[PDB]
DNA sequence: CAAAAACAAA
DNA sequence: GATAGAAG
DNA sequence: CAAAAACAAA
DNA sequence: GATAGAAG
């Protein structure tokens, strides 16, 4: 069509109107305005004018940033005007800048694989996680699960289901059943909707109980179901402060201690203790991380560290 | 321009005219004809007609095949009419079929990583290679180098340079300096033209001498410099028969023994004996195989087998 | 007199 | 086809 | 009476 | 941007 409103954005601008403090929502503003402007636009060249002006405002911002912004625009257009709107053929970044973006990523990752960080104090890190599994503070439990199960924060906190995994005619003690994969949309070969088994790094018993507590806390019951902008607003800076605090003294010198660090390490340790002999590391990761079928490319991003044992062994060839 | 001839094709058709035997060069024929037809064509829509007819002849052939054929066409056009000819915007496969081709590859490789083949008798395989390093028959030596150094056949046989590698203030005994990477064209981040160090699987001494012999044999001196269609014609079926013969009794049951098998295994063993602790397997491969800078995607294709030791270890976690 | 959305990076 | 860590 | 380019698959 | 294992 030629009309409709981006409800979600508007909502956010409206709340923003009466906050005790905070910087101005100028970008949600540009988007809202843009969407208004589009109403009763039939002509491509006009739509092009509107987009091109938007692009030009964004000059100065970082490439990675610009690209993210373009997504906010696109979801807004899609929300307001549906999927079929010709503005979605226009509102995109140019191809050259995408091409460079790719290059940049390849370079980064290629550099990590050539310079893995030795996770000297890793066992300490996992103990700490295990211990947080026993904390009264739901946040702490959460951190504990990210360390122990490898689920992303958003997963742990707002939407993960954890079943006990059947191990023959009993119960698996080194893995649980997980559901609520994020970053995934329905489709052949996709973990969306799918329950599946992932190794964990301490008694399935423990883990499962801890998730029960978290699920039942006040803050937990709040978290449960939150969209991502919600969850980020509620919890991101807190969780980042906590994790920084908590692991600061044991994290490899090379980098600062961040929540996703747990998922990276988790993959590494799980592989190291549990990987069967006939699958590759890339495969094992893409498996335990809930990656799409045949997606082996994404594993490459989690190859971050090396365990001091593995490092010691390489050196054992002198 | 609007004129020129594909010299190489013509040459091949001409030789073909008086062979004692062999099937008819009908495809080089279609290409030659096509190139003739293009002479004095200025109009896109005509060029489109010519291509579309070519495409339609190719129906029935396999996708992988068709795509290869399209390359022969394109190199022919490029040879005859240069790089700038608008027919190169037309002579290509459709995008849907490429997209599927990609899918197909991803699926294949994703399947190998989930079902690695245990190379039970691998040490036998490498011994055999070592022993061929001592054969009087240059072919045999060649096989020996593919097993021992990981260079592709075309590399070993026609254009590889092997220096001794400096190891501190002496000489490296577990690696040599290599040059003549094939499948590579000049460019930032490319091993073309580049000498570089690759591990080998037996005394650098041995290897280097053996390559000297091969280089100095009659057949060697012939091989040296051959284009790829030459080399294939001269040597491919022979080398495939030999390798089939030679390794038939020790190759994993799962697959037949083929020359590239050596390069796959080579990567695996080199990693297993020589990989430093701070680099990933993907990285190590892309390194020792002469892959482009930041190319980590191509390593994924060489992850084919698993060593019975590594397999035994995985199982050691019961 | 010193806490609570933009900008950016698998 | 481009998505989902500076206002008492 | 039985060896010497098409077709295809990193 | 698409390249490089059935004629004595
Ligand atoms: C460019 C892009 C990358 N990705 C991530 C996921 C994988 O790690 C990788 C693609 O390989 O990039 C997305 O999820 N969406 C995108 O639009
Ligand atoms: C599609 C294509 C693949 N490749 C190979 C090399 C890498 O293994 C892989 C790309 O990733 O495919 C080429 O060399 N050229 C091509 O045109």
From TrEMBL, chains A, B:
Q: Which residues carry this modification: Phosphotyrosine (covalent)?
A: 302
Q: In what residue span(s) does the Telomere resolvase ResT/TelK catalytic domain sit?
A: 121-305
Highest rank taxon of the organism: Bacteria
The name on file for this protein is Protelomerase
Q: Which organism is it from?
A: Agrobacterium fabrum (strain C58 / ATCC 33970)
Lineage start: Bacteria, Pseudomonadati, Pseudomonadota, Alphaproteobacteria, Hyphomicrobiales
Gene that specifies this protein: telA
């Amino acid at each position: 069509p030629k009309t409709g409103v981006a409800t979600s954005i508007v909502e956010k601008i409206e709340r923003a109107e009466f906050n005790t403090a905070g910087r101005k929502p100028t970008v949600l503003l540009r988007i809202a305005d843009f969407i208004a402007a589009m109403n009763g636009m039939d002509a491509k060249q006009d739509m092009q004018a509107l987009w091109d002006a938007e692009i030009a405002i964004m000059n100065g911002r970082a490439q990675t940033t610009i690209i993210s912004y373009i997504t906010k625009y696109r979801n807004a257009i899609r929300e307001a005007f549906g999927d079929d709107h010709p503005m979605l053929k226009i509102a995109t970044g140019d191809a050259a800048m995408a091409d460079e973006a790719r290059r940049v990523k390849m370079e980064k990752i290629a550099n990590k694989h050539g310079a893995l960080i030795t996770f000297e104090n890793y066992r300490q890190v996992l103990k700490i996680c295990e211990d947080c599994l026993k904390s009264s503070d739901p946040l702490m439990i959460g951190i504990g699960l990210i360390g122990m199960t490898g689920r992303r924060p958003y997963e742990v906190f707002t939407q993960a289901e954890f079943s006990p995994a059947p191990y023959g005619k009993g119960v698996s003690k080194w893995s649980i059943l997980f559901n609520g994969q994020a970053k995934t949309k329905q489709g052949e070969g996709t973990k969306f909707g799918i329950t599946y088994e992932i190794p964990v790094l301490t008694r399935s018993e423990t883990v499962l109980a801890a998730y029960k507590r978290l699920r039942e806390s006040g803050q937990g019951k709040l978290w449960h179901g939150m969209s991502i902008d919600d969850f980020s607003s509620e919890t991101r800076l807190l969780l980042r402060d906590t994790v920084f605090n908590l692991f600061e003294d044991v994290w490899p010198k090379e980098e600062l201690p961040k929540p996703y660090g747990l998922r990276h390490l988790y993959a590494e340790v799980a592989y190291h203790n549990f990987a069967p002999p006939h699958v590759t590391k890339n495969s094992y990761f893409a498996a335990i991380l809930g990656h799409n079928n045949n997606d082996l490319e994404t594993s490459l991003s989690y190859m971050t560290y090396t365990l001091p044992e593995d490092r010691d062994n390489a050196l054992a060839r002198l």
